[PDB]
Symmetry: C5
Subunit: 209 residues, 5 copies
């Protein structure tokens, strides 16, 4: 079959509001952040505008097909498949999606979605104009799916932090580290996993002593 | 059955425009605010910009299913469900929902919806810069349903008021008290239950 | 023996959201009454005011009536399932920000009430806002496409305390509010358009 | 028949995505503007904010009905009708439609749509503070329909230029002239018509 | 055959969510930007605000029809057609489309979509206040379709960069070059084609 088939058959088996739990185990969702820009820093309100590619991967076997005589990958609108309800806990604005909202689907069910998002956060901005720089931490995890339904882990990949960071930004990234956590709230006895991304950055062109 | 059948049935029996009233009693809705941040405050205009989690709970028995051998909790888009028409009587901006608009439904018909919201209000800001701080009161209750259709009560959760409040904020929380109240309009005898959330806060300082 | 669901269903099957509920030929009599709640961004230089008001809108569609002797007399219904007056604030300079859930209240006699809380910017006389006499900002609301024979507006001059629901925390206070009614004829359509002109007399607070 | 029947037919015959070409002639679209306010002038960046009524008329015979035993005209949501894809060429902000998006359809097929729009334009603001004022020119015409598909002409009237212009604006209209124009693009050999509206305005003097 | 049939047929054959690939050769999409305005520029943050016409073209054979006795072109809502998933790799604000979202389709299946877009970008603004000016580069290409699926090339046509540029802008265009280019991301092998538009502009001012 061709691509027109693959989409047709995907539109059938897929249920965008039904999380693809396999057997009985959380859907493993990987979240890796690639910072592109730092636009508005306010050391007085501790708020920063950030631009980043949120690489998100997970598997949905209800999507898998045979790619022997058909493409191994196709681009699909995210409104046509289940997507993790991730949220940035310390975000103070809705996530502004800058790119077309298409996901990449492989015939084995692996799914990739990597939007470029622009968002404002509440975090530690103090130190931004100092050698050590400021460290702003961003918490991302599912909003309604606890640890047994969704587990989030930082796609561990020793990659250059400023690999895609605009060379024209007033800031420079000193260092980015992705960590995994687990919070239990009052509503429920089960834990909610998340990933803390600590972005260490500072202003460029500071005077030397 | 699996999560798909559950979600299938929920979607097939849910009446998003009909208030789920069992018998003649109103729908019991619980509303609890958890302050996450205080973004901008203006003492001169008595206006504040705040972020909070609006824990909301109610019941809809028609949605219930047998969880003997199946999941007894699923995530559901609120557009597929009846949701209480709550409004902040003193909000000067429409609520900005920052999180995925999904509710959580237990097999017993209990529905939990807790959106993180950013919204501006017209309240008393005086004293924000004093040790006593200021006390901004926020009233939330149904907009069109009165006491016989919807009852509102604070989810008494003896917990820390700053448990989830941002440490990087410029303000700090002195105390939060959520009291049950009621509003009435000249035209009519009917009353609308609400919850008065008193946020006692002040600007961080050591002087 | 009808539950709210049966009530809504009968409404959804007879109400025509895009069709004005005209009786015979007579125009649909709409009532418009504003209740001010707050006055925010005021500018005497540019003559622009930011206001929050409850816009009480009432009319009737008897085809939606039912017997409430042993059933609910009213129900809340999404305005999208109903026909609603195409009202517009003529001197507004920003589209209205509806702060409340967009639900209407339909009564068993066919009466329909819709009261959204609205935040909207207006172009009006702001001079003297800081004088004992204050400023008088006039707001004109009326149908945008329905002329006097299809829709008529009546300011429900339900004498009340003008600042009854007005924010105490506002930097301003209401001195007096007056509901007026007017009619205009544009070079498009022979018959006139009816509107209600609300005069808002307010001023900056300050002990003196 | 009744208004509901009329709206029923319209929804049936009308093809909102198809231009109502009579015979094989282009659809004649009259465009006229009635300035209501001038809000955010900036003589440095040559940008202005304007509120205006865009009187737009045209014909769509495939919507006509027998008004012998029925109303002559009705209000219709523009989503149920084909509408000219007009764009203000020098606009720098999307149009902010401040009014209910209903058009007026007459029995013969005449359509009138007049939204109040607020939009920011890039044009000559120089001299706004002088006595002769400035002259900002706004160009409005179809975006994808050329001369042989759509023709636009300024249907002027006997109305005063500031007949509906707010007296509370910091600016006053000195004169408005609306000329028809025509441009050819690399796209294709056929040109596109547009109305060019010139607004001569100035900041109000002092006592 | 009239326009009603052409659109009706498009609605029957068009797959807006399926890339119209001929056999296995990538879809040939042409991009070229026409600068209309430069509204804001920050010498310190290296950010510009601009307005441009993004002339885009490609082939969709399944849309073809016979125009021997009907029109060979029609304006169609892009929501009824597959559209290239282009994105500006260095944009810091999502595109604000200023014009009606209608594409033009020729009887031979060729599609032309030219929206006027206002968008914010991160690029080199240094030298913008000098005679040689600054050079801001904008990279545009598919977001998810690598080279084997989509190829992008500039409509390299000798012309006047300032042809449709606003005379009321505070800036002026000195030269615009559009080069093809590609980008491969560590992860995966396949590369993503893109068009690199270099805008050489400067602040205008006799001195
Ligand atoms: O960094 N990457 O690995 C990949 C990319 N970065 C920018 C565009 N890009 C290609 C891409 C592939 C799949 C998806 Cl779902 N989204 C984007
Ligand atoms: O505070 N809480 O009780 C619970 C939560 N706080 C942040 C996410 N969270 C989990 C959660 C569960 C169900 C629903 Cl409907 N929404 C959110
Ligand atoms: O003033 N009143 O009579 C009534 C009200 N004022 C604000 C909310 N309110 C309740 C209400 C009633 C009917 C409708 Cl349709 N919407 C809201
Ligand atoms: O100026 N006019 O001719 C007409 C009007 N100006 C403001 C409202 N108005 C009435 C009106 C009629 C038809 C339509 Cl489609 N829209 C508005
Ligand atoms: O530059 N051009 O070739 C063409 C145009 N520039 C502005 C409007 N215009 C007309 C036009 C043609 C096709 C399409 Cl799809 N959209 C607009």
């Amino acid at each position: 079959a061709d691509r027109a088939d693959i989409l047709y058959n995907i539109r059938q088996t897929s249920r965008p509001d039904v999380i693809p739990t396999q057997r009985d185990r959380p859907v493993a969702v990987s979240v890796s952040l690639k910072f592109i820009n730092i636009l508005e820093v306010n050391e007085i309100t501790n708020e920063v505008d950030v631009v980043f590619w949120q690489r998100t991967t997970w598997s949905d076997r209800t999507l898998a097909w045979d790619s022997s005589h058909s493409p191994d990958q196709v681009s699909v609108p995210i409104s046509s498949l289940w997507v993790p309800d991730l949220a940035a806990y310390n975000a103070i604005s809705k996530p502004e999606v800058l790119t077309p909202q298409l996901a990449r689907v492989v015939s084995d069910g692996e799914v990739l979605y990597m939007p470029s998002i622009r968002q404002r956060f509440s975090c530690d901005v103090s130190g931004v104009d100092t050698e050590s720089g400021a460290t702003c931490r961003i918490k991302i995890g599912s909003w309604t799916h606890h640890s047994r339904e969704i587990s989030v882990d930082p796609t561990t990949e020793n990659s250059d932090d400023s690999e895609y960071f605009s060379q024209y930004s007033r800031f420079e990234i000193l260092d980015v580290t992705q960590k995994k956590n687990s919070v239990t709230y009052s509503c429920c006895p089960e834990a909610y996993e998340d990933v803390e991304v600590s972005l260490n950055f500072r202003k460029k062109g500071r005077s030397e002593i």
